[PDB]
Structure formats: C-alpha cells, structure tokens
Design a protein around this nucleic acid. Structure first.
Ligand SMILES: [Zn+2]
Ligand SMILES: [Zn+2]
Ligand SMILES: [Zn+2]
Ligand SMILES: [Zn+2]
Lengths: 529, 72, 186, 585, 187
RNA sequence: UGACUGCUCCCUAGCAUGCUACUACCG
RNA sequence: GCGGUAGUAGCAUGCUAGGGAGCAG
C-alpha cells in the first residue's frame, strides 16, 4: 500500500527500579533462589512482525476425516447445547472498550467508538443484513504485542476491521454472552477464578470420574496451524444457534463472511497486504469461543480415535465394546445424525473425559483406567490427532498429567492450583508463577508505571493475583505476596508524604489501610462474591 | 546478580531505544538480540559478556555524555 | 465541622437542651427546644458530612493532580531518568569489564563498533591521546573489556596507517591523535 | 508545575486567558481572576466544565466535581468551588505565599501595549514582572505583525523596483529597516530559504550582502519566530570580595593609558563598573586594554550587526594574534575568516542575533542601550558566567518605540539598572582622548556628560550652524522639503570639496530624492555604527520634540573624525551649542 | 427558586410569625400559622423536587443532544475522509491495463490477487539476504509475474538508497538486510 | 501504530431500595 | 393525646454511567 515497507519494532520494558530495589531489600532475587525473574518485555527488531506472520506457513491445507468430523461436530454441538444464541439487533450489542483500534483502514480516522457512533442502529442493522446475502472481505492488521512474557518470540494479535467485528458481534454475541454466563459447563469462559470460582470450576471438572487423573495438553502454533476445516467447523457450531433468526442462505453467507474476514482475509502485516493461508485470526469477535469449540473438537476426535484404535475383542466391558461398534457405525456406516448415539457418546465423554475448556487451554479429568485401556484419549491420542488433523507435533513435554486430585491441574490459564484450607474446608486456589507477578511489578510498559505512587491500584491488583502464593509451602512464594503488601504500604506512605510536602497538612481520612493487609485479598478467594 | 544484570540490560536497551538506535536496522537488531539473550541467559558470565557487548553500543555513540552521567 | 454557622446553632441548641433537662422542665418547654434541636442537628450532621465529603474529594483531586503532574514530568524527563538509572545500576554491578569500558569511554577510548565476545572477530576503538594508549596498549596486546585484544592495525584520524612501535611519549605530538586502533580478541 | 510569576511560589496554574500562560499561585491567580477579565486558568488539565457540550470557562462559575471540574448547571451533588477563600483551587493550595501587589499584573495583562503607562509599569515593577511584561510585549508585537495575510506578488519587475501591496484595510507597515522580513519560500510543498531581505525606499530596493537566487512562484511574507520564555533579569546580584586570590597576574600592560589600570583591576574584582563612553568612542579601546592587561579573563564580544563590529574585527588581528581569535558560529551564515575547528579557545566571537550556549569570565555588553528588556533578558539567560560586568552608559541611546502613540520616553528612564548607574557617577577615569577634538566633546560634556570628558586639543572652529524654518507636510510618514535641498545644493556647489561623504539622515525621503542628483546611498542614523569617514554632514529637518531629544543621534554624533556640522531645526541646541552662527542664503 | 409564588407565602408566614412572637398570640393561632408555612413548604418541596428534576432532565437531554450532534459531525468527517480515500486511491489504478484485464474476464469479474500481479505499474520486492537477491533481483532489470521489471530504487530497512553495486557477497554484511527494491513495469 | 473476550480492585457522578431525622398538614 | 399519609434531607443497599489500573486466554 505504501512505497516503503514499514518495520515495526517492540520496545524493551520500562524498568521499575523502585520496586526492584524494594524486592532485593526484602531478600528477593538471591543467587540460587527458587523465585527468579523469568518474564520480561522481550524486544523485537524491525523484521519481527513479518517473521511472526510467516508462522502461518504452519497452516497447511488439511482434509479432515469427513465421516469422523461430521460426528465430532455433533458431539461438540451437544457440548454447546445448554447455551442459547442467535441474531441480535444493533441496539442489543455490548461492546467493551469502544476505544480499541478498528482494523484497517478504519484506524486511520478513529477507534471503534467513531464507527459505533457514526453508524446508527439502523445503519449497523443494514450492514449486518448485508452480510447475510453478501460477502465483505476485510483487511486484518497484524499488530505486534507489547506485553511481558517468558518467551523471546514476538507475539502478534490480529486487528480485525470494524466492518467484520461489528457484524460478527451482531451474529455471535448472544451465544457468546450465553457461554460466558453459564457456570458448571465444559467451556469455562466467563467463569471467574475469584470468590471460589476456581474451586467451583475444578469441582465441576471432577464431576463423576471413577478413576480420575488430570491431563492438560498444548496446541503448538494453535492460532497459526489450525486447519481451515476446523475453523469453519467452529464457526458453524457457533452458528448452530441460528435455526430461526437466519435462513440457510443467511447462515452460509455469514460463514462466508467469517472465512473471508478471519480465516483467509488480506493481512496488513507491516505496510503491505498479504494472503492469510488459514488458521485462527486470533483477533476476531469469536476468538476465545472459536478456539474453545476447536479444543472440544480436538478432544472429541482424540476420544473417537482412542475408541476406534482399540482392540474391541480385548475390551472387557460389554457396554464400551458396543459403544465402539456404534461409534464406527455412526462414523462410516450411518449417514444421518444418530441423535441417540450422539447423546450416548456425549454422556460417555462427560462421565469419563470431563473437560474444562477455554481458548485452546484445557484441563480434563479423565478416567485413568479407561485411558490405560484405550477407552479414552490419554495423551497419545491427542498427539496423533494433532499430527494428522492440526499439522503440528504435540510434544509430551508440553503436556502435564496429575494423577492425584488433591493437587489440582498442574497449569490452567497459566495458573497453578494448590489445595488450601481457608475457613474450615479445603478449596483450590489459582496461584500464578511468582516470576510473572514479580516481572509485572519490575517491568512495566509505560514510564509512568515506574513509580508506583502514580498507580498504586496496579500493585493492588498484582497482590490480588499473588495472594494464593501465601498458602504455598515454599516460603519465597508467600514472600512474593508479603513483598507486594509491604510495597503497597510503602507506596501509600510515600504518596501521603509527597502530599504532605505539597500541603501544610496531610490526608486524615484514608481507609486505605486494607491494601497492605491480607484480609482484603483473602476475601477475593472466598466463596462469597 | 543475574537479576541485576538482566535489569541493567533492560534499562540499557531502553536508553538505546531512546537514542534512535532503532533508526539503524543492523544496530537495533544486534541490540535486540543481545538484550533478549541476556534475559534468557542462565549464567552470569555469558550474560555479562553480552552486557558488555550491548553497552559498547551506547559507548560507541556521541549522543550520550558519559562524564556527566558518572556523578557517582 | 466546628467552622460553620450550622455548628454554632447546633451547639446552642444542645446547650439549651442540656440546661433544660438538668435544671428541670415540663414536657412542652423541653419538647420545644428538642424540636428546635433536632432541626439544628439535621442541618449540622448534613453540613459536616457534606464537608467531610468535600475534604475527601478535594484531597483526592489534589492527589490526582499530583499524579498527573508526576506522570507528565516523568514522561518528559524519561530520557535523562533512564540514563541516570542505567549508570547507577552499572556502577552497582561493579563488573570489571563494564567498569573498564565505562571508564575508558568517560576519559579516553570509546568503541567504534559493537565489541565482540568471540575470539575471531575484531574491535575498533578511538584512543584520543597517549595516556590511554599507554594505559591500555602494551606491545601487541590491547587490554579492553577485561579481555586481551591482539592489535592488528592502528590508523590515525587522517586515515594514515602507522606502525606499532612508533608512538611514544616524545613522538606522540606529531600524528593525528584521535586514532583508530583495530584489534582482534584473543 | 513551577514557581509563580508574581509571587515566586510553586504552582501548577497557568492563566489561560493571558498570552504566555504565566505561572500563578492560588492566591495571586484568584486575585488576577477577580480583578480582570482573565477568567480562565490552566492546570495539569484546563479548568473547564468537562461535561460534554458546555462552554463555561469562568473559574467563578466552575466548581470541582468528580474527577473533573464542572459548573453549577453540570456539577455533581458533591460540589467544590475552584476559586474560594481568596485562592483558586489547585496544587500548592496550602504551600502558598501570594502577594498583595496584584494591581500591576491585572493592569498590564489587559493592556494593548499602546499607552506609555504600560512602558512605565514595565520599567517600574519587580524583575519577574518586568520579564513577563517584556515577553508579553514581544508576543503582542509578533501577533499584531502576523495578524494580516500573505503579501502575494503576481508580477516580476526590474531590479530595486517592486509594487508591493497591502491587505484589505491593513495599514502601512514600517518601511524602514525596523522589521527585517525573514520568510520561507514554497516551491510546491515545503517552505525553505526565501533568503534574507531588507525593505527600503527606492519601489522596494534590497541590499543583499551575498548573492541569492529566487524560485518561481515564491511569495514574500513575514513569518514569525518562536517567542521563548524569559528566565534571567536585567541585572545579576552584586557582591564585592575582600582579597585577590586564585588569579594569574600578567606582566604586560598598555602604556598609552596610565590612569586606567588601577581601576581595571578593581573591575576585575568588583561586579559593576559604569563608564560614560559613547559608542565606538574609546569603547573598543577599553576592551583591548583589558585583554592586554587580563589575558586570563574570558571575554565574549557581541554586536547587533557584523558591519558595525567589522571595525573591531579588522583591528583585533592587528592588535592580537590570529591564534587567539576565534568565532564559534552556531552550526544564517556569515564570513569564515576567523579560526575553524577549535572548540577550546579563550576569546570567541559571535553576534547578539544568534548567541549560542557559552560561558565566560568577563562580559562586555556592547550596545546595551539599543536593546530592550527582552533582548537584555535573552542575553542574560542564554549566557552565564562567574563574574559579570555591565559596560554601558544610561545616556547612550533610547530604545525605538513601535506601538507607542501617546507619551515620550524619558531619557533618564531607559532601564531600572541604568537609573542606579547614573546616581553616584563613574568611579573610574579614561583620560586618554584618541578621538573627536573639543569641538563636540566639550559641547556634549557641558550638556549631558556632566562636563567630565577630557579636552586635550583646542576647538578648531570646524563646526557650523544654520537657522531655518521649513514647512511641515506629511505624505505617508515623512515629509519632503524642496527649499532645504535647494539650499544644500547652493552650498555644496560653490564648495564641491565636501561632496565626498555618505549622507546619513533620520528620514530616508531626503536621500531617496537626492539619489537622482548625487547618488549617495541611504544609511539610517540608528544603525550607522562601524562606518566612519573624514567629511560628515547631518540634517534632522523637522523641529518636533520626539526627534530632537537630548541624546538619540549620539551614535553618529561621535562618529566624526575631524568635525561635524549641526543643523538644528529646534531652539534648544541654539543656547546649548557654544559655536559661531554662520550666514545661510 | 427565586421567582415562584411560594416566596410571597413564605414572607407572609414569617411576618405572621413575627407578629405572633411580639404580641404573644394563642396556641391555636400559632398552629394555624404553622399549618400555613409548613404546607407552603409542602408546595415549595414540590417546586424544589419536580422542577429541580425537570432541570436535571433538561440538562441530561441537552448533553445527549450535544453528544448526538458531535457523533453526527464525526460521521460526516469520517464519511468525507473515507470517500476522499477511495477517490484518491481509484485515481492511481491506471485503468488502462485494469480495463484490459477486466474486459478480458468471462463476466468482468477477476480474482483480487491478480490485479496487482497484472496491472500494477510498480513492483516492490523485499529480500532478506543476498542469496535471494541474486536469484530474484539480479541486475538493473529482472523478470517476475510473467512481466519484465526494471529497478528504479533500492533501499534498506533504514530507508537509505543503496546502489546496485553495493549488493555483493562481501558487501552484504555492511547493509541492513531486508532490502526493498522498487521496480517499474517494462514494455 | 495500540485487537477480541472475561474477571477483579479504586475514585467520582446520577438514579432505584432499606433506614434515620426533626417542624406541620389529616382524622 | 392518635395512625399517620406523606413527604423532603444525614445513613445504608443496589443499579447505571464515566475515568484510572491489574491479571488471564
Ligand atoms: Zn442469525
Ligand atoms: Zn502568585
Ligand atoms: Zn490572565
Ligand atoms: Zn457545565
């Protein structure tokens, strides 16, 4: 588009010398300490956005087992059954952070606020109905992510145009809000980890598993290697709720808009257009939920492959053997949906392979004695399914397995789980990697966050995220939260001191003495919202 | 010590970015590589060598007054 | 609280009520000054709570103005603040190679390129006078970054290549002294 | 967030309705708001109702609300007036000093800079107020000169002949060299390097020192510059030490003057030393004598033009070696005859138009009289030293007035420091006269110089006076007098030996008319320094008081080398001059 | 607030209260006086609750109207900007070859990926190393996309003009390497 | 140049509900 | 001496809006 290529770099993080000095004053970052800085704002050179966009080379044209995929779709739809969705009018659309960028070229003139203010509800409704019988290809701007991470690889997020995002909101937001309003479901998007929500999630995962083990896996290059068939399946499953609001032509044209906007659109990496081969444009209005249905599809495919790639003569249980027989029947013999067996297999999966699904992050409480017998995907069925249906090799070193349920999932949503005894009962608290919180305190992305006095609530939120470290058996982990409390106290005391130097008096009524106290943060993880 | 040298690498790359080092693609790429390798380093010898290499970039320019900034 | 006419009226009403109760009064005469006391108390507890809110909001607004001013002064002095922080942390590191290169850049030679860490690549420095030349160079060896660099070529500021054993105390002031010594790591 | 202008107190409040947004503490900002129409003050964010679609800016109507400022019609229930208890709300609302003296600020803020009262208040106020007044005066001048459009030239004509028009209703700008047009020509997109021009009566004739080229489609306009704030006052605090320690006494002195080193040594130890020296008359000799006596003191030379200081430059090489002479030009161009590529030197040359960052030990404020408080503050702030000496005399030169309409500047009230300089008299003597004889020195000494100047030689009776009446008739801003030119021709015809001088006239019209008969160039008397010749002739034409002051032409009065004629159209110089009257046909 | 009929009623009530206080009237007269002032306070309570609410509602409506007017102004500005962008990018289309390929289509419809590949008067090649440079942009002219391209300018990631003689095996490490060579269509 | 979604803290503003507070109307 | 109905204001709860910030995928 321009006469010269635009090389976008990623700046290094802005140091927080005050917080780092306070931490080392409290005996942190000692030579050999179990807690060390591992998360940093890794900088990137000019040819980094295009280098990360080239990771779409891992997106290959993948032909799926169609007779198997058509059954996995039914099982995933059974997973997405308790929710409700459909078209909503422009007046019923909820948009958080209207001051976010609006793709290309709409970012030249303003944020999404301009295009949600310049378009009346009738204008947005006309645009959304236009996509029900037309296709609007859109330009997706590839933006370098400027955030703290433990990996030096450049992170990129897809900036989808306001034309695509606005219509995808009106098409999917009802279902998405229903998904992020349901508790005790397989997809835990919208379920808070605070106020006992993490414990509720984990207890729902341990629903009725007879021989429970915890198993989480990893999708390598998930947003880059997801086959276009699986992304289309995700969009169709999300479109399964439009039985009444949309005609078949309307649903197909909405799917075509999805594919032309977030699957094979024109990417604007740098200052020039490119063709996206496929995969998840992980900036679309359904990124988390499409990744969730993709994850459920991969898990169901792994379970189906485990059942079918099992010696049925050696399957001692007469129910599981018949289930495998009818599974083969419904895959390659039955042509129409066998809703009876779809429900039966969905119930079998819920009983023996209960899942906790977010956007490509998952924890499964699976029947260990079944996965040992190949009646449920243990980890190798996941590896094989990724190999032949995702064009990646799932390394088993990126896949944990916890055989004891008293200690929860090894890692879910980058949060570890430990069973703490708050009140009089035992609950599971999500504690993060202490290096992550320490780096967030020490490395910040604006210079104004280099003095905490400016944003004390930032460290309040970090201590909220770091409170469950207090119960950790390792003292340095608890020392992280204690250090954050002491630093919050120091910040408040220096803010009051600076204000006193600017006045002839000081603030008398504070009520801020709860920020450097464990009571304010303990209530954040107790089941009383 | 290791955390100290990593944080010094962070602040050094910050001052380099403030000095329009990114205007030189080769120099900025080398600085980014050194900064990212210091943060990924596990020993305080390789990290310190890369820190010396990165600081040589700052000392190679006339945009920063080295005598004035050494107030001790 | 006690700096308003409402407080004066409330105090007068309270004193009158207390005096009437202690001295002894009938139901009607006491109820009169109690109805005249409750109105004053309502007008004073509202006024002082409004004053409490005003004091808290004014302190919060001055705190917010201080935050914005500090943000602007840190975002406008960031170039100097980051450099000062970097040099303080560098002198805190007390690393021999870092201290050596920092002192050289302060007083004498500065690198002309990124100093390498491999034992094959070369280094170019800018020695401006004989003091640093004698302190750093000794024969064919050049001490820099706490490492031994093998001198390979010395060129003055006029692009004039000169030999090694030719610059000494007495013969120093006859060549362009901002020279560029090229050396290789040992 | 800085010190207050009128009170020197820390404050984050800028008076928005003012021009330069001065820093005002809460109490004085409230006083400025209630005593004038400056109802707008700024902060970290401007004091305005942040409710959308509101247009109140008055701090009185503005009340502190939530996280922003609102008005009575848009305030939350928790409302807090910004200006109350005698101070407007803001930072340093408790650590405040204030000042009862706010009348001067309220008066000067609303003034149009068209009355003499504004000049009087600027000359008589606090130093911070004086600097603020100078900055606002410059801002008003540059906003009034930029208050018009772009003068478009559609045709090209012969050399020194251009028909330049004005805007619709725009008055005639000053045709003299008072305003030097410095624009930037646009070829198609970018405005760069129109060149340097100087408008003069021809009909506009340009006198370019160096060659220049003109593009196609360019236009001539007066682009304004960036009015920087002011930091240093006119004078620095004064102190005298006790003993001479830490200096390097040299053994070489100038033997021509034997009664000046004993006071130059004191100047080297005292802060201020005022001398009664007219420009270019023994003034350059003092600097050379100090340089010879004190080569270890760092002296910086500044001038308003290179042409006037060209005489100093030509004699510096004949008096001082080439090696010590240096010119650190800010690297919009000049000659390169001085040393190049040498940062470390004792004596450095520059110009007051572009004074780079520097530091010295002895400062010679050359032409300190013709510089207003804005110029004096710019030099005092952009340059700093350890010892500061102010070389100049109050009775040297008045500042030119641009927007003044009523009132004449008093000769004694040029500056506030100059008022103190002339109170006790000079403490040094310069009894070496290498200049004009007692024909003009004695006359000026008995008039203004307090009869202190030295008369070594006698009066050669080489000065003459003529009495005439003349007729006053304005055309645009001047007058043309045929009989005066006829008398000049009738005088010069019988004695053509005096027709070898460059005529200097306060009004350019006379020389412009006479260029067709004699061909002499037109040189203004205000900046005629640096050009000296044997034969000199003076003419002031009119008899008004605003032009015949005590000492305005003193720059060219002492530029004579053998004697200068005096044609006084007023009656004041008839009684003051002790010369002999001569007949005039 | 300051122009309502209840003000005169309150003034009359205060005058009657002063008269009763000075004279020392009976309890019935005082009760009747209180029943007047106190229910005039009832009338003014409504004038300070419904009228004050109407004033707040009017301010809110005026604020919403201001926001809607600003939104419409932003809509007009964005419409003009988008229209001008479309009109100034259409003028660079070189509609000669564009019509040559459009009219050559089966129904005037062509894929988008071929319009720059067939009707673009300028080609920009981004090259990561000399090994790919010698293969693609060799010499002052090269062939790509079934067309002949002649180089008019080569720049590096620093956007510095680098001459063709500088692209050498030994001079490669002395250049910033995403080299961006811009070429023009030959004919 | 600054994506989509989710959860949590802090400040302010206005509005719905539980009180509390007093004057008198009405029987 | 009566139930108040009401009312309108300190106090509490909630709902909404606006701003600042933190974590997660
Ligand atoms: Zn629909
Ligand atoms: Zn003040
Ligand atoms: Zn003002
Ligand atoms: Zn308002």
């Amino acid at each position: 588009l321009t006469n010269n290529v635009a090389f976008q770099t990623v700046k290094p993080g802005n140091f927080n010398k005050d917080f780092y000095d306070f931490a080392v004053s409290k005996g942190f970052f000692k030579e050999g300490s179990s807690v060390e800085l591992k998360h940093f704002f890794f900088a990137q050179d000019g040819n980094a956005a295009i280098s990360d966009y080239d990771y779409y080379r891992y997106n290959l044209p993948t032909m799926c087992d169609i007779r198997q995929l058509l059954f996995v779709v039914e099982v995933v739809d059974k997973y997405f059954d308790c929710y409700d969705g459909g078209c909503i009018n422009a007046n019923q659309v909820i948009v958080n952070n209207l001051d976010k960028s609006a793709g290309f070229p709409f970012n030249k003139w303003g944020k999404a606020r301009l295009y949600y203010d310049s378009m009346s509800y009738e204008d947005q409704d006309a645009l959304f109905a236009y996509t029900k019988r037309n296709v609007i290809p859109t330009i997706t701007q590839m933006n370098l992510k400027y955030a703290i991470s433990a990996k030096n690889r450049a992170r990129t997020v897809a900036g989808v145009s306001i034309c695509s995002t606005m219509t995808n909101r009106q098409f999917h937001q009802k279902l998405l809000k229903s998904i992020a309003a349901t508790r005790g479901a397989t997809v835990v998007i919208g379920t808070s980890k605070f106020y006992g929500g993490w414990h509720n999630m984990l207890k729902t995962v341990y629903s009725d598993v007879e021989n429970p083990h915890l198993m989480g896996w990893d999708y390598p290059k998930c947003d880059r290697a997801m086959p276009n068939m699986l992304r289309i399946m995700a969009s169709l499953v999300l479109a399964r709720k439009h039985t009444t609001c949309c005609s078949l032509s309307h649903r197909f044209y909405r799917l075509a808009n999805e594919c032309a906007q977030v699957l094979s659109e024109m990417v604007m990496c740098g200052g020039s257009l490119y063709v996206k081969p496929g995969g998840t444009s992980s900036g679309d209005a359904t990124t988390a939920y499409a990744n969730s249905v993709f994850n459920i599809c991969q898990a169901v495919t792994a379970n189906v492959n485990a059942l079918l790639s099992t010696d049925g003569n050696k399957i001692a249980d007469k129910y599981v053997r018949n289930l495998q027989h009818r599974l083969y029947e419904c895959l390659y013999r039955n042509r129409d949906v066998d809703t009876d067996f779809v429900n039966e297999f969905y119930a079998y999966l819920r009983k023996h392979f209960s899942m906790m699904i977010l956007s490509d992050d998952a924890v499964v409480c699976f029947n260990s004695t079944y996965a040992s017998q190949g009646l449920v995907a243990s980890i190798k069925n996941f590896k094989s399914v990724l190999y032949y249906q995702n064009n990646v090799f799932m390394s088993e070193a990126k896949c944990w397995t916890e055989t004891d349920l008293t200690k929860g999932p090894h890692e879910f949503c980058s949060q570890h789980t430990m069973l703490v005894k708050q009140g009089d009962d035992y609950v599971y608290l999500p504690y993060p990697d202490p290096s992550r919180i320490l780096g967030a305190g020490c490395f910040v992305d604006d210079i104004v966050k280099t003095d905490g006095t400016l944003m004390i609530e930032r460290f309040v939120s970090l201590a909220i995220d770091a409170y469950p470290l207090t119960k950790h058996p390792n003292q340095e982990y608890a020392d992280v939260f204690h250090l954050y409390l002491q630093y919050i106290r120091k910040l408040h005391d220096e803010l009051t001191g600076h204000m006193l130097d600017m006045y002839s008096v000081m603030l008398t009524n504070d009520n801020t003495s709860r920020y450097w106290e464990p009571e304010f943060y303990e209530a954040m993880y107790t089941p009383h919202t | 010590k290791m955390s100290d040298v990593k944080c010094t690498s962070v602040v050094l790359l910050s001052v380099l970015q403030q000095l329009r080092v990114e205007s030189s693609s080769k120099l900025w790429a080398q600085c980014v590589q050194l900064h990212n390798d210091i943060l990924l380093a596990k020993d305080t010898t390789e990290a310190f060598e890369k820190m010396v290499s990165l600081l040589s970039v700052l000392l190679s320019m006339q945009g920063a007054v080295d005598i004035n900034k050494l107030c001790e | 609280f006690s700096s308003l006419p409402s407080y004066a009226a409330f105090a007068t009403a309270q004193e009158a009520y207390e005096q009437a109760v202690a001295n002894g009064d009938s139901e009607v005469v006491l109820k009169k000054l109690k109805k005249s006391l409750n109105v004053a108390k309502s007008e004073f507890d509202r006024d002082a709570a409004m004053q409490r809110k005003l004091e808290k909001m004014a302190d919060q607004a001055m705190t917010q103005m201080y935050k914005q001013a500090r943000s602007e002064d840190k975002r406008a002095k960031v170039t100097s603040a980051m450099q000062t922080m970097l040099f303080t942390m560098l002198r805190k590191l007390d690393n021999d190679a870092l201290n050596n290169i920092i002192n050289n850049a302060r007083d004498g030679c500065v690198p002309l390129n990124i100093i390498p860490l491999t034992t094959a690549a070369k280094l170019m420095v800018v020695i401006p006078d004989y003091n640093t030349y004698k302190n750093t160079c000794d024969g064919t060896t050049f001490t820099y970054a706490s490492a031994l660099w093998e001198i390979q070529q010395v060129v003055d500021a006029d692009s004039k290549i000169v030999q090694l054993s030719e610059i000494s105390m007495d013969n120093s002031p006859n060549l362009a002294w901002p020279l560029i010594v090229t050396a290789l790591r040992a | 967030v800085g010190a207050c202008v009128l009170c020197n107190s820390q404050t984050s409040l800028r008076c928005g309705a003012c021009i330069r947004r001065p820093f005002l503490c809460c109490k004085c900002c409230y006083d400025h708001v209630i005593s004038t129409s400056h109802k707008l003050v700024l902060s970290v964010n401007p004091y305005v109702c942040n409710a959308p679609g509101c247009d109140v800016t008055d701090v009185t109507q503005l009340y502190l609300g939530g996280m922003s400022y609102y008005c009575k019609s848009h305030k939350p229930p928790i409302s807090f007036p910004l200006c109350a208890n005698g101070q407007v709300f803001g930072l340093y609302k408790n650590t405040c000093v204030g000042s009862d003296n706010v009348t001067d600020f309220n008066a000067i803020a609303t003034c149009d800079w068209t009355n003499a009262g504004d000049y009087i208040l600027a000359n008589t106020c606090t130093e911070r107020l004086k600097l603020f007044a100078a900055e606002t005066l410059k801002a008003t001048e540059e906003t009034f000169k930029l208050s018009y459009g772009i003068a478009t030239v559609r045709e090209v004509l012969s050399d020194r002949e251009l028909h330049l028009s004005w805007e619709v209703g725009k008055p005639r700008p000053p045709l003299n060299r008072n305003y030097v047009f410095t624009g930037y020509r646009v070829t198609k997109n970018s405005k760069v390097q129109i060149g340097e021009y100087t408008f003069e009566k021809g009909a506009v004739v340009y006198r370019g020192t160096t060659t220049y080229k003109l593009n196609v489609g360019d236009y001539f306009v007066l682009t304004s510059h960036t009015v920087m704030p002011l930091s240093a006052p006119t004078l620095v605090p004064q102190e005298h030490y006790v003993r001479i320690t830490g200096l390097y006494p040299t053994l070489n002195i100038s033997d021509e003057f034997s009664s000046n080193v004993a006071n130059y040594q004191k100047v080297g130890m005292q802060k201020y030393s005022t001398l009664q020296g007219p420009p270019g008359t023994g003034k350059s000799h003092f600097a050379i004598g100090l340089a010879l006596y004190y080569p270890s003191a760092r002296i910086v030379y500044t001038a308003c033009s290179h042409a006037a200081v060209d005489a100093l430059c030509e004699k510096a090489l004949k008096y001082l070696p080439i090696d010590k002479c240096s010119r650190i030009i800010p690297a919009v161009e000049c000659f390169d005859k001085f040393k190049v590529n040498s940062t470390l030197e004792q004596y450095v040359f520059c110009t007051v138009n572009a004074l780079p960052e520097t530091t010295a030990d002895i400062v010679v404020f050359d032409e300190i009289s013709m510089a207003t408080n804005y110029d004096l503050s710019v030099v005092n702030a952009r340059l700093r030293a350890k010892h500061y000496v102010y070389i100049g005399d109050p009775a040297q030169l008045p500042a030119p007035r641009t927007l003044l309409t009523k009132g004449t500047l008093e000769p004694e009230y040029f500056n506030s420091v100059c008022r103190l300089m002339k109170t006790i008299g000079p403490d040094m003597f310069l009894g070496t006269c290498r200049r004009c004889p007692a024909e003009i020195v004695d006359t000026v000494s008995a008039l203004v110089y307090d009869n202190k100047l030295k008369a070594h030689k006698d009066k050669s009776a080489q000065c003459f006076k003529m009495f005439y009446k003349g007729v006053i008739t304005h055309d645009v801003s001047s007058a043309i007098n045929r009989p005066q030119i006829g008398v000049v021709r009738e005088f010069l015809t019988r004695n053509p030996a005096w027709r070898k001088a460059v005529f200097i006239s306060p009004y350019n019209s006379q020389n412009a008319v006479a260029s067709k008969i004699l061909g002499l160039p037109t040189q203004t008397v205000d900046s005629s320094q640096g050009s000296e010749y044997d034969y000199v002739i003076f003419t002031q034409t009119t008899e008004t008081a605003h032009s015949c002051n005590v000492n305005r032409f003193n720059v060219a009065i002492t530029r004579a080398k053998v004697g200068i004629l005096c044609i006084m159209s007023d009656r004041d110089l008839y009684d003051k001059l002790q010369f002999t009257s001569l007949e005039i046909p």
